[PDB]
Each structure stands twice: as structure tokens, then as C-alpha cells.
Amino acid sequence: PTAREENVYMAKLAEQAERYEEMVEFMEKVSNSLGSEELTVEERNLLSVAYKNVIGARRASWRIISSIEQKEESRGNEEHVNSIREYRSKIENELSKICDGILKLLDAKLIPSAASGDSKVFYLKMKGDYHRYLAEFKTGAERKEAAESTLTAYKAAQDIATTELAPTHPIRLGLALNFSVFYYEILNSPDRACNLAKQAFDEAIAELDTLGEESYKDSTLIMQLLRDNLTLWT
Amino acid sequence: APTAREENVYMAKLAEQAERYEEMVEFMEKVSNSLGSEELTVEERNLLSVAYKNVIGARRASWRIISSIEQKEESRGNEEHVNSIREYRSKIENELSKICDGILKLLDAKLIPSAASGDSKVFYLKMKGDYHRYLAEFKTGAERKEAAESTLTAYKAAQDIATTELAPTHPIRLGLALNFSVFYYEILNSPDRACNLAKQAFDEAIAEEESYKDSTLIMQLLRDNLTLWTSD
Amino acid sequence: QSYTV
Amino acid sequence: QSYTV
Ligand SMILES: COC[C@@H]1O[C@H](O[C@@H]2C3=C(C(C)C)CC[C@]3(C)/C=C3\[C@@H](CC[C@]3(O)COC)[C@@H](C)[C@H]2O)[C@H](O)[C@H]2O[C@H]3O[C@@]12O[C@]3(C)CCOC=O
Ligand SMILES: COC[C@@H]1O[C@H](O[C@@H]2C3=C(C(C)C)CC[C@]3(C)/C=C3\[C@@H](CC[C@]3(O)COC)[C@@H](C)[C@H]2O)[C@H](O)[C@H]2O[C@H]3O[C@@]12O[C@]3(C)CCOC=O
Ligand SMILES: [Cl-]
Numbered sequence: 141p142t143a144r145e146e147n148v149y150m151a152k153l154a155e156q157a158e159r160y161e162e163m164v165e166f167m168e169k170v171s172n173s174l175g176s177e178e179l180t181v182e183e184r185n186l187l188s189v190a191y192k193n194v195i196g197a198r199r200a201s202w203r204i205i206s207s208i209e210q211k212e213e214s215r216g217n218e219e220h221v222n223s224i225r226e227y228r229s230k231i232e233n234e235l236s237k238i239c240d241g242i243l244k245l246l247d248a249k250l251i252p253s254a255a256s257g258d259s260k261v262f263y264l265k266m267k268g269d270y271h272r273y274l275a276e277f278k279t280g281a282e283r284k285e286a287a288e289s290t291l292t293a294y295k296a297a298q299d300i301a302t303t304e305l306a307p308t309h310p311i312r313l314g315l316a317l318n319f320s321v322f323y324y325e326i327l328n329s330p331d332r333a334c335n336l337a338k339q340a341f342d343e344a345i346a347e348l349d350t351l352g353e354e355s356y357k358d359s360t361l362i363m364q365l366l367r368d369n370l371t372l373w374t
Numbered sequence: 375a376p377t378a379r380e381e382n383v384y385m386a387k388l389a390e391q392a393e394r395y396e397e398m399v400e401f402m403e404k405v406s407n408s409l410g411s412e413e414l415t416v417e418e419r420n421l422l423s424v425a426y427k428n429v430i431g432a433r434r435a436s437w438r439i440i441s442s443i444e445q446k447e448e449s450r451g452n453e454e455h456v457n458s459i460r461e462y463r464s465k466i467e468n469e470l471s472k473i474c475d476g477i478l479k480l481l482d483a484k485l486i487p488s489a490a491s492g493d494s495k496v497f498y499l500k501m502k503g504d505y506h507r508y509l510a511e512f513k514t515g516a517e518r519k520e521a522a523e524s525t526l527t528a529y530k531a532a533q534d535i536a537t538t539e540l541a542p543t544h545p546i547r548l549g550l551a552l553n554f555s556v557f558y559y560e561i562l563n564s565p566d567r568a569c570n571l572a573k574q575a576f577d578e579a580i581a582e583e584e585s586y587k588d589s590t591l592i593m594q595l596l597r598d599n600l601t602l603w604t605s606d
Numbered sequence: 607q608s609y610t611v
Numbered sequence: 612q613s614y615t616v
Binding site: 141153154156159197200201205219227 | 375376389391392394435436439454455458459466
Binding site for chain 1: 612613614615616
């Protein structure tokens with residue numbers, strides 16, 4: 141069987157069972173307990189999924205709790221607000237911890253060992269994403285640093301993608317999607333956002349006839365997501 | 375300023391919105407295990423019931439999936455995969471066992487003994503049947519026989535009180551009718567009994583404001599069950 | 607499986 | 612609220 145293989149099998153089982161904390165642990169075991177090889181395409185994917193699911197449940201809790209705090213602040217109900225805030229801290233504690241897990245692995249192994257430009261772009265996107273989720277709830281200097289750290293990882297990842305990866309490449313298309321959302325949501329810049337999405341979109345469109353059956357599903361899907369953000373924003 | 379009871383109840387509503395059901399259980403346990411003689415308000419018991427339902431409901435879902443996967447790997451001949459699944463299935467089963475224990479313990483010690491009206495009597499009794507039913511779904515050997523038996527006893531007891539005590543429209547009477555008829559179907563493996571219990575309780579409330587929404591919903595679950603059942 | 611409430 | 616991947 142091998143040590144790296146059934147951990148992978150276990151991570152697939154945990155995915156099916158919708159038990160994402162366990163999924164992460166399995167992919168961790170896989171990840172640092174290799175050496176200096178890269179993660180395989182399927183391992184990369186399973187990692188980013190495992191973390192996205194764990195973090196998203198908390199993102200969703202934080203939004204709903206953060207919205208109730210605000211409505212209870214209008215009503216003048218000051219005690220509810222104290223209780224809610226304290227809960228909100230608990231969820232924020234979890235968020236900082238989760239982000240720290242992935243950001244630690246990315247800086248220590250994953251970014252330093254990516255050899256193909258595909259992979260450099262992949263892990264630099266991930267790093268961008270996790271800082272972006274710190275910038276969603278941190279405030280003041282903590283926010284300012286998360287936002288700065290985000291901009292540079294996306295900037296780096298952009299500078300490589302435009303010059304080495306096809307315009308239709310799903311990982312290139314993914315960077316542009318999140319990068320545009322980062323501007324819209326973090327930096328309150330609708331127009332930078334619109335134009336960055338639109339350009340990425342049109343550039344993919346002009347290369348369409350040469351798009352592999354291998355990347356077809358994912359590319360067409362990220363192309364629709366770029367269109368939907370545009371439509372909602374516009 | 376809100377009491378401790380008031381507060382834990384509130385913390386529980388936040389946890390429900392945030393979809394953090396383990397925490398919602400703990401806060402609702404706090405409200406219960408700070409009482410003495412007092413029985414819970416309708417609101418509170420509805421909350422405990424929702425709290426536990428979602429916590430177990432996620433393990434039961436995980437369980438079915440993992441079951442389907444070893445069974446598919448049992449026949450692919452895949453031997454090492456089957457064992458890993460097996461050991462994972464057990465880990466899901468420990469959680470299941472521990473969760474049911476939480477709510478059975480509190481039901482036998484507090485909630486059942488201090489239920490005065492025929493309202494509360496039928497409720498914790500439904501609850502007891504429910505959680506022995508979840509045990510039955512996964513236990514084997516002696517443990518299985520025991521739980522399915524405890525399932526019948528509790529369900530049958532609550533039945534009397536329901537028929538003699540509560541309107542056949544009432545949400546609680548109808549819920550019991552639904553769950554009971556499912557027990558006969560899935561565990562007792564007898565279609566006809568599931569169909570008789572379900573057919574009658576529908577027909578009875580076909581005869582009889584605060585309850586409209588809840589009732590018509592459980593009335594619809596009955597038809598949805600009978601029609602599915604009849605067709606298979 | 608089958609509907610319960 | 613925006614779509615990401
Ligand atoms: C989720 O891990 C499994 C895998 O990821 C690959 O997909 C990558 C991908 C997603 C796609 C559905 C767009 C979303 C998560 C994932 C792993 C992430 C990324 C995308 C592109 C941007 C990125 O985000 C990179 O971020 C660092 C790539 C790597 C996809 O090919 C596979 O090609 C998909 O084919 C199936 O299997 C994949 O997703 C699916 C199960 C099919 C999608 O279902 C219907 O189309
Ligand atoms: C807040 O706890 C859930 C609550 O349960 C109460 O209703 C009881 C109930 C259910 C009905 C929606 C069918 C399902 C969960 C609950 C609490 C449980 C049960 C039902 C029927 C039997 C039982 O199951 C109890 O098992 C011991 C009764 C107690 C309902 O009145 C409320 O009347 C519902 O109206 C709103 O609030 C309730 O659900 C809603 C918010 C109304 C919207 O319904 C959904 O579409
Ligand atoms: Cl968040």
C-alpha cells in the first residue's frame with residue numbers, strides 16, 4: 141500500500157463523510173511528511189479543498205454572527221451585543237488558527253519546492269486566498285498587513301501566470317477570479333475589479349478554439365464565475 | 375439583565391444560526407442541568423430537540439456514506455480498503471453511541487420523570503424512541519435486540535397517551551405517528567404495519583391556527599411516506 | 607431514507 | 612458575497 145497512499149485514501153473517505161477537519165489532518169500527514177518532492181496534482185487539489193471547506197464553515201458563521209451583532213447594536217440591546225461579540229471572538233480565534241495552519245505549510249515547504257510554474261502559481265494563489273480571509277475580519281494594522289501580504293502574493297502569481305500559462309488554464313483563470321474579488325471586497329475598488337475580470341475573461345475567449353478537453357470542464361466553469369461576478373457588480 | 379437560564383437559551387439561538395450544533399447542545403445542556411424540579415418551556419425543549427437532531431444527523435449521514443463505500447469495496451474484492459473503512463466506520467460509531475447516551479441519560483434522569491401534562495409526556499417519550507432508533511440503525515448482536523426493543527416500548531407507551539390525551543391534529547401526535555411508522559418499516563421490517571399506523575393517523579386528522587403550519591407539514595410527511603412505501 | 611420529524 | 616474558486 142505505502143504510507144503516503146492510504147493517508148490519501150483516508151482523505152478521500154473523510155471528504156465523502158463531510159468531515160473536513162479529518163480531511164486536513166490526513167493531507168497534512170501527507171504533506172510535510174514527504175521530504176522535498178512536490179505534492180502531486182491530485183494531492184494539491186485535495187489539500188486546497190480540505191482547507192477551503194474547514195475555513196468556509198467559519199467564514200459563514202462569522203458573517204451571520206457579525207450581521208446579528210450589528211442589528212442588535214441598532215436596537216440598543218447592549219447586553220446581547222456583549223454576548224455576541226464574545227462568541228464572535230471564539231469564531232475569529234478559529235479563523236486565525238486555520239489560516240495559520242495553511243500559511244505555515246505554504247511558506248515552509250510548498251512555495252519553496254514548486255518547480256513547474258503551474259505549481260508556483262497554485263501555491264501563491266493559496267497564500268493570497270488565506271491572507272484575504274485574514275483581511276475579512278482583522279482590523280487596524282493586522283488588517284493593513286493581511287491586505288498588503290495578499291496584494292503581493294497575487295501580484296507575484298499574476299506576473300508568472302500571464303507569461304507561462306495558457307489564458308484558458310483553470311489555475312490562471314482562478315487567480316484572476318479571486319484577484320478581482322480581492323479588489324472589489326477588500327480594497328473597495330469596483331472598477332479595478334471589473335476591468336481585471338473582464339480582461340482575463342476576454343483573453344481566455346480569444347484562445348478558446350485551442351482549449352484542451354482535459355481542462356474544458358474547469359475552464360468553462362471559472363469563465364462563468366467571472367461572468368456572474370461581472371453581472372452582479374455591473 | 376438576563377438570568378443564566380435566559381442567557382444560555384440566547385447563546386443557544388446564536389449557535390443555531392451559526393450552525394455550530396455541538397455548542398448548541400452544550401448550552402442547552404446547561405439550561406437543563408441547572409434546574410431541579412422545573413420542567414422546560416416549550417421553546418427550550420424544541421431547542422434541545424433541534425440541537426441533538428442536527429448533531430446526530432450529521433453522524434448518521436456520514437455513517438450511511440461510509441457504509442455504502444465498504445459494501446462497494448467488499449464486492450470489488452478490495453481487502454485493505456475494506457479494513458480502513460471498517461476502522462473509520464467504528465470511529466463514526468463511537469460518536470454516535472456517545473451522542474445518544476447524552477440525551478438518553480438526561481431523558482431517563484430528568485425530562486421523562488417530571489413531565490406533568492400529556493403534552494410533555496408524549497414528547498420525551500417520542501424522544502426516547504427516536505434515540506433508541508438511531509442505536510438500532512448501526513448496532514449489531516445483543517446491543518441491536520436491546521435497542522430495537524427499547525424503541526418499541528417507548529413508542530408504544532407514548533402512543534396510548536397520544537390516543538387518549540391529544541387531538542389527532544396535534545403536531546406531537548402526528549410526529550409520533552410518522553416516526554413510529556418509520557420504525558416498523560426500517561427496523562421491524564414490516565411494510566403493512568408501517569402502512570396501517572400511517573394510513574390511520576392521516577385519516578383521523580383528516581377529520582379534525584397555532585398548529586396549522588406544523589401539522590399540515592407532518593401530515594404531508596405522512597402522505598409522502600405512504601405513497602413512497604406503496605409504490606416500491 | 608424515509609421521512610421522520 | 613462574491614464568487615471565488
Ligand atoms: C476538487 O478536487 C478534485 C478536483 O479538482 C480539480 O479541479 C481543480 C479545482 C476545482 C474545479 C472544479 C474548478 C475547484 C477546487 C480546485 C482543486 C481548485 C482550483 C482549480 C483552479 C483554481 C484553483 O482554485 C487553484 O487554487 C489554488 C484547479 C486546480 C481545478 O482544476 C479537478 O479537475 C476536478 O474534477 C473533479 O475533480 C475536481 O473537482 C471535481 C470533483 C469535478 C467538478 O465537478 C463538476 O465539474
Ligand atoms: C425553533 O425550534 C423549531 C421550531 O419548532 C416548533 O415546532 C415543533 C417542531 C417541528 C415542526 C417545524 C414540525 C420540527 C422541530 C420541532 C421542534 C419538533 C417536533 C414537533 C413535532 C414532534 C417533534 O418532533 C418533537 O419531537 C419530540 C413539534 C414539537 C413542533 O411544534 C415551532 O412551532 C416551529 O416554528 C418555527 O419554530 C419551529 O420551526 C420554525 C422556526 C417555523 C418554520 O418551520 C420550517 O419551515
Ligand atoms: Cl470570515
